[PDB]
Nucleic acid binder design. Structure first.
Ligand SMILES: [Cl-]
Ligand SMILES: [Cl-]
Ligand SMILES: [Cl-]
Ligand SMILES: [Cl-]
Ligand SMILES: [Cl-]
Ligand SMILES: [Cl-]
Ligand SMILES: [K+]
Ligand SMILES: [Mg+2]
Ligand SMILES: [Mg+2]
Ligand SMILES: [Mg+2]
Ligand SMILES: [Mg+2]
Ligand SMILES: [Mg+2]
Ligand SMILES: [Mg+2]
Ligand SMILES: [Mg+2]
Ligand SMILES: [Mg+2]
Ligand SMILES: [Mg+2]
Ligand SMILES: [Mg+2]
Ligand SMILES: [Mg+2]
Ligand SMILES: [Mg+2]
Ligand SMILES: [Mg+2]
Ligand SMILES: [Mg+2]
Ligand SMILES: [Mg+2]
Ligand SMILES: [Mg+2]
Ligand SMILES: [Mg+2]
Ligand SMILES: [Mg+2]
Ligand SMILES: [Mg+2]
Ligand SMILES: [Mg+2]
Ligand SMILES: [Mg+2]
Ligand SMILES: [Mg+2]
Ligand SMILES: [Mg+2]
Ligand SMILES: [Mg+2]
Ligand SMILES: [Mg+2]
Ligand SMILES: [Mg+2]
Ligand SMILES: [Mg+2]
Ligand SMILES: [Mg+2]
Ligand SMILES: [Mg+2]
Ligand code: NA
Ligand code: NA
Ligand code: NA
Ligand code: NA
Ligand code: NA
Ligand code: NA
Ligand code: NA
Ligand code: NA
Ligand code: NA
Ligand code: NA
Ligand code: NA
Ligand code: NA
Ligand code: NA
Ligand code: NA
Ligand code: NA
Ligand code: NA
Ligand code: NA
Ligand code: NA
Ligand code: NA
Ligand code: NA
Ligand code: NA
Ligand code: NA
Ligand code: NA
Ligand code: NA
Lengths: 160, 154, 92, 186, 95
RNA sequence: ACAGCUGGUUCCAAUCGAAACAUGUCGAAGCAUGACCUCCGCCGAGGUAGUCUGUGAGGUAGAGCGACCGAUUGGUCCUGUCAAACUCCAAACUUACAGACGCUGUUUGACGCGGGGAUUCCGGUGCGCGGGGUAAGCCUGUGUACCAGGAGGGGAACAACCCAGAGAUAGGUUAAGGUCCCCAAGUGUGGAUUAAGUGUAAUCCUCUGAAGGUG
RNA sequence: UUGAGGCGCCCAAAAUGAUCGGGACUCAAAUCCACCACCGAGACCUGUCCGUACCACUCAUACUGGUAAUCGAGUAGAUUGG
RNA sequence: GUUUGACUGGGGCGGUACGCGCUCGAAAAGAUAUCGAGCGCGCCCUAUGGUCAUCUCAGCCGGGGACCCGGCGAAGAGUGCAAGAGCAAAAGAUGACUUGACAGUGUUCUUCCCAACGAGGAACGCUGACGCGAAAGCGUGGUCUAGCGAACCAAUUAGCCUGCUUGAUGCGGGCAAUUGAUGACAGAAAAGCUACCCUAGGGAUAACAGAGUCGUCACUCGCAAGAGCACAUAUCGACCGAGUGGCUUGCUACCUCGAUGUCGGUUCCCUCCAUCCUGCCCGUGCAGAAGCGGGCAAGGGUGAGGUUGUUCGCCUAUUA
RNA sequence: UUAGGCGGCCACAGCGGUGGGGUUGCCUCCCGUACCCAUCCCGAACACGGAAGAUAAGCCCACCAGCGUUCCAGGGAGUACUGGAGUGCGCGAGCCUCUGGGAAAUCCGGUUCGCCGCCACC
């Protein structure tokens, strides 16, 4: 199913699990990556991937983008490189599909998506000055898998 | 005291806004009225803000418009110094204008129509799709700004 | 539900509270001499008999209470509004 | 106390002094309240009316100001209670008060208790108050006979200070008689 | 509405803020009003009896006599004149 | 024959001027009763479409949840997220009443009362707020203005987009929009960008153009 | 070396004859910032007249005079003169 | 001889949004639709009703998942049943007493906002008689919002009125009210087929074509995991993301029901390019030959047969 | 108000903590069961009778802010949202300008350890 079907925020918030059953599990494997035993403050460089447009990102997209980003960090810094990446959003919004025609149209439950407002941090990675260009590359690959245009922003980091 | 001129027509305008203009004695486009600066009147002009031009005119400008467009409660009669003198509590147009500006009286109290039926703006106005700060003619005006309009609608 | 066979309550006849006895209204037998009985015979003929060709309706899931409240001293009964009750058993 | 959602009782409920459910029912009569209250040593009676900023006491009597009329006995007993009610009732009559409802606060409606004695006193003073005769103590006990018969089992004076040995319910009569008298400085 | 009972859509208006929870003070339940007095109608969530139809919350009527301990307040619902039976517990003096 | 269904129903003008909704209905292609339109008689001084202020009503937006509730991360307090059927909070705004100003009414009688006569109960579109739906020149609400029943000016044409509400005739000045020609008015002025004929396309079924990329 | 902004370029495939209404336009007849002067409705102003409502006079709803900035569009329909 | 209902993204099947209650939808007054989301009611209770007295609950802790003692504990317990709301010297618990779950008659709100409309419901009175309490006071059933039913007829309750000249008896007719059902729930007594069909109409509403949409379908692009002996990018290419087309399918119900003649085929004309061949090119896992992939490009060509009505597709021999 | 009674507002009053105060005065704790009355068992409580003792509880007075609450300044913020208008921008979801309104979290510093009414009373 194309994202065109779910990317917009044209529907009421639909997250109350006490009134919604049969919700598919999330495909997102992890939210905390790298060295989760270490603190973010232990790093000189902090780069975030910022969403430029308000949208809904299906859990399948979060996984694909997160995967393609962390997979790169692993390939360039090693399975235990000195870095830590975070996917701060969780797919709370439940999605439907009307899969009879328009009669009794209320859709059956098909998935979940995360609502992200423009200007927000979807991903935030923490690394050393050396690995700064590696995290910028992970993010480049990550924004190619989500609907909106993004900004790769260096927050804590002035070895520039 | 501010001068109110309707620059946008009744078609498609909210009924509560249209009724506000009617309470302010304006029933046609280019019709002007003088309104005291009170809390009650302030709310009324703010509501009408988008279909009108308003602001405090200068003594001179008011005198020009009063002389040229003022009318009695009933009839054609020109409102000149003599008329003002023989029917009002003042000696001439200047005295009336000053009183109006200082909010001591009203056109009605002096036996005059509350409405100054202006002429279209000579040279045209700045447009009814944008406010003054955007180059248009709608909303609050400068004293110089109001004067320009009132004089062009002489 | 359960209900006392006898209990103190208002007697509209004596005009004062007294012990009443509650009994379920037993159906009185028909005489077959009422006007409607004569109309049935009179108006029934060849073909359909209009209203007289109709048959007894159905049943509501639960019926209302149909009782007689007898004054224990003057012996005169009175009727009251019934209330829906699946079953009604008297205590004693 | 615990947070924003926490519910703190009304002040007089925390203090455990006012029964608000009983108070409402009392106020429904539209009549003034005959507030009967006790203390370990004294008995107080007040005729209270409703007010915009709080209750208004139009008349009252305390068992202490009983001596002002010739009382030499203790002030936390039956005779004391009746007389304090009568005194309050008499002062109530003077203030234009004709009727009242008995408010006993957090006290118990025990038959023959002191609050009913206060009630009987006020009624005898001239106040019309909804009551029940068989809940009031029999006349002799109000006089203080139960205490005299108690001192009869002497061997040691009931009263520490010297008011008298065998006590006097006759003193009760003298005081009542003094109050029922028209003159009396209220 | 999915139903048409008196309490439909009254979740907000008939619920107390957690701190105003519990038995209300008797003072306002015994208040006395005179014929002609303007009173604001507002159901007190804590007081069960003496209420009016929730649709009238917020109305400001005129006391025009009483029935028993309750008051008879005159209001105008839209364009229609109505008489509302209500106790002091749900009434407040205007101004 | 009957039909709640289709068709048709013939002169002029002046005043007012809808409803396409609610309740009931073997009712949904129909009726009745209300709403709303109109006419007549009565009453006799107030009325309230606007704003301001005062006294009240309210939990939508937003926000937040070591404030309930239920969702929702990780680490050896900290750290990561949410709610149409959550709320410690909380608008704009809507609304009851009153006063004030405004406007209106007392020969144009308002407000209101009583009675006669209807038409109407297929609606539509724009904007704002919506609920459903991948979406629709979709379905179904809501507030408002418009079309319907609204001319004339503009928009190439074009029910509802812009100006504009209009007796006749006449002169004049503007509005929207426009001033190179077609075509009334500038091949106007100061300055800058663009080399793609990008563009010369407010709005839109209608005018596309996206993620991504560009020494 | 790096950050930001403006315009454009690539991404960009459809059926009878291409299009911004057309012609055609490039220091513009495009775009953005300003500004100047004009054209252009039945709107607005103004002369005369008509209708309708109201006022004065009147038997008149016959004349005469006066008022309308706050009268003049209209399907179904109600009312009225011809 | 008749009936065989209505609702409905046409109708039928399914369902009941056909009578009711709650939260949300509902846009912070009121009102508000859909075959909208969550889910309930057609009872049950003599106490699970009423009053009074005494009393305070969940849960946790400490001392001897039963019991006993103490402490913390505004409410998360309990209160018949949905949901939301209310309640702590109580509306909850225990105990005791009691029958107001009473008769009669109203005022008002609701049903039906505004704004007419019945049954039903509720609030608040009065008259009468009672219960409990010291008393104020409480009790018009259950803390509040669902738990309901016309006329005709019958049975039932107490008294009274009345039946054709008149008296007696019988048996009737009536005033007030209770009970008996119509759930299609403001109430008919009610099954189907028609391709043998017929009429009135409707594009108010379906099939076909058109139109809108584009989920489906076709094609493309971005990113490039992966494999391709090593090598992402000769070639193949997942996930995810962005699109174009209007050939399929589905949706919608705008257009036509006083008719725009169906599928497939045929014949004859024009066109599109996302190119199968042919021309000119680039790369190659390009020695050559034969290929594979890509670019420009629509001038021309793209044929004959076997099964099947087939479109499509399978198969044969030819073919650039 | 040198300690009381009835209240209104119902946390600005709650939670927690420190200090001070009572010879025939006040409130209490306190002492005690013949009586009125009382415990499904207990004079514990309720009720009645009373002063040998005490200020340790409670209570009243003075005060502390750590928690909870109320309000105020500055910051967040004229941000978020929003009533009215636009041939303003954007493929579009959406945004911007003008006009009239205007939060919440949180941070920081203050405030708040009740206020008021009637009666009685060295
Ligand atoms: Cl029965
Ligand atoms: Cl006491
Ligand atoms: Cl009501
Ligand atoms: Cl018009
Ligand atoms: Cl060109
Ligand atoms: Cl004529
Ligand atoms: K057809
Ligand atoms: Mg005039
Ligand atoms: Mg000009
Ligand atoms: Mg212009
Ligand atoms: Mg027969
Ligand atoms: Mg005609
Ligand atoms: Mg005419
Ligand atoms: Mg709400
Ligand atoms: Mg929100
Ligand atoms: Mg609203
Ligand atoms: Mg029409
Ligand atoms: Mg020219
Ligand atoms: Mg072009
Ligand atoms: Mg556009
Ligand atoms: Mg007309
Ligand atoms: Mg027949
Ligand atoms: Mg048949
Ligand atoms: Mg049907
Ligand atoms: Mg509402
Ligand atoms: Mg009840
Ligand atoms: Mg029948
Ligand atoms: Mg029966
Ligand atoms: Mg029905
Ligand atoms: Mg109904
Ligand atoms: Mg036919
Ligand atoms: Mg159609
Ligand atoms: Mg043909
Ligand atoms: Mg090509
Ligand atoms: Mg060709
Ligand atoms: Mg001490
Ligand atoms: Na179906
Ligand atoms: Na993207
Ligand atoms: Na016969
Ligand atoms: Na309360
Ligand atoms: Na027929
Ligand atoms: Na309709
Ligand atoms: Na209908
Ligand atoms: Na019909
Ligand atoms: Na006025
Ligand atoms: Na919003
Ligand atoms: Na119109
Ligand atoms: Na045109
Ligand atoms: Na071009
Ligand atoms: Na007409
Ligand atoms: Na039927
Ligand atoms: Na009724
Ligand atoms: Na299609
Ligand atoms: Na498409
Ligand atoms: Na035709
Ligand atoms: Na064919
Ligand atoms: Na070709
Ligand atoms: Na074949
Ligand atoms: Na036992
Ligand atoms: Na002490």
């Amino acid at each position: 199913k194309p994202a065109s079907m779910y990317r917009d925020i044209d529907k009421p918030a639909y997250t109350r699990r006490e009134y919604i059953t049969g919700i598919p599990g999330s495909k997102i494997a992890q939210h905390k990556m790298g060295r989760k035993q270490k603190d973010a403050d232990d790093y000189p460089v902090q780069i975030s991937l910022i969403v430029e447009e308000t949208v809904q990102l299906r859990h399948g997209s979060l996984e694909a983008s997160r995967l393609s980003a962390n997979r790169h960090l692993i390939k360039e810094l090693g399975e235990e490189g000195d870095y830590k990446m975070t996917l701060r959003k969780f797919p709370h919004q439940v999605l439907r599909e009307n899969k009879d025609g328009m009669r009794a149209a209320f859709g059956k439950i098909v998935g979940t998506a995360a609502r992200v407002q423009a200007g927000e941090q979807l991903f935030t990675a923490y690394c050393n000055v050396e690995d700064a260009e590696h995290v910028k590359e992970a993010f480049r690959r990550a924004y190619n898998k989500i609907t909106p245009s993004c900004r790769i922003k260096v927050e804590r980091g002035e070895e520039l | 005291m501010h001068a109110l001129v309707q620059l946008r027509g009744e078609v498609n305008m909210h009924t509560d806004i249209q009724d506000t203009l009617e309470m302010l004695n304006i029933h046609h486009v280019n019709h002007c009225t003088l309104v005291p600066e009170t809390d009650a009147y302030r709310g009324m002009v703010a509501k009408v803000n988008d279909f009108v031009a308003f602001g405090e005119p200068s003594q001179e400008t008011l005198e020009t418009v009063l002389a040229t467009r003022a009318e009695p409660l009933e009839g054609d009669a020109d409102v000149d110094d003599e008329w003002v003198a023989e029917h009002t509590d003042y000696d001439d147009i200047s005295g009336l204008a000053f009183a109006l500006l200082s909010e001591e009286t009203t056109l009605r109290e002096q036996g005059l129509s509350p409405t100054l039926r202006l002429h279209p703006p000579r040279g045209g106005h700045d447009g009814v799709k944008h406010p003054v700060k955007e180059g248009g003619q709608l909303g609050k005006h400068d004293t110089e700004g109001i004067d320009d309009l009132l004089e062009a609608m002489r | 539900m359960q209900m006392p066979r006898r209990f103190n309550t208002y007697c509209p006849h004596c005009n004062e509270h007294q012990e009443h006895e509650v009994e379920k209204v037993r159906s009185g037998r028909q005489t077959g001499m009422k006007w409607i009985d004569r109309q049935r015979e009179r108006n029934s003929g060849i073909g359909n008999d209009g209203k007289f060709s109709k048959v007894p309706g159905g049943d509501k899931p639960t019926k209302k209470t149909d009782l007689k409240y007898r004054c224990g001293e003057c012996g005169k009964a009175h009727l009251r509004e019934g209330w829906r009750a699946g079953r009604l058993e008297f205590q004693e | 106390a615990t947070g924003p959602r926490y519910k703190v009782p009304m002040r007089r409920r925390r203090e455990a002094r006012t029964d608000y459910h009983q108070r409402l029912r009392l106020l429904k009569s539209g009549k003034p309240r005959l507030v009967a209250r006790k203390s370990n040593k004294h008995v107080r009676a007040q005729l209270v009316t409703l007010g915009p900023n709080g209750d208004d006491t139009l008349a009252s009597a305390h068992s202490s100001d009983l001596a002002e009329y010739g009382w030499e006995a203790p002030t936390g007993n039956m005779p004391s209670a009746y007389l304090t009610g009568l005194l309050a009732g008499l002062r109530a009559q003077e203030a234009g008060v004709e009727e009242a409802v008995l408010d006993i606060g957090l006290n118990s409606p025990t038959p023959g208790s002191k609050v009913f004695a206060i009630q009987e006193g006020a009624i005898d003073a001239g106040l019309d108050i909804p009551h029940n005769d068989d809940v009031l103590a029999d006349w002799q006990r109000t006089r203080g006979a139960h205490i005299a018969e108690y001192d009869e089992q002497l061997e040691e004076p009931l009263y520490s200070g010297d008011f008298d040995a065998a006590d006097l319910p006759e003193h009760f009569d003298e005081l009542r008689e003094t109050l029922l008298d028209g003159d009396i400085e209220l | 509405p999915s139903s048409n009972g008196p309490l439909e859509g009254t979740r907000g208006k008939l619920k107390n803020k957690p701190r105003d929870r519990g038995t209300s003070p008797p003072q306002r339940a015994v208040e006395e009003f005179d014929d002609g007095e303007k009173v604001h109608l507002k159901i007190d969530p804590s007081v069960p009896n003496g209420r009016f139809h929730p649709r009238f919350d917020g109305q400001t009527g005129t006391v025009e006599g009483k029935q028993g301990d309750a008051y008879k307040v005159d209001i105008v619902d839209g364009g229609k004149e109505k008489t509302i039976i209500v106790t002091a517990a749900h009434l407040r003096r205007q101004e």
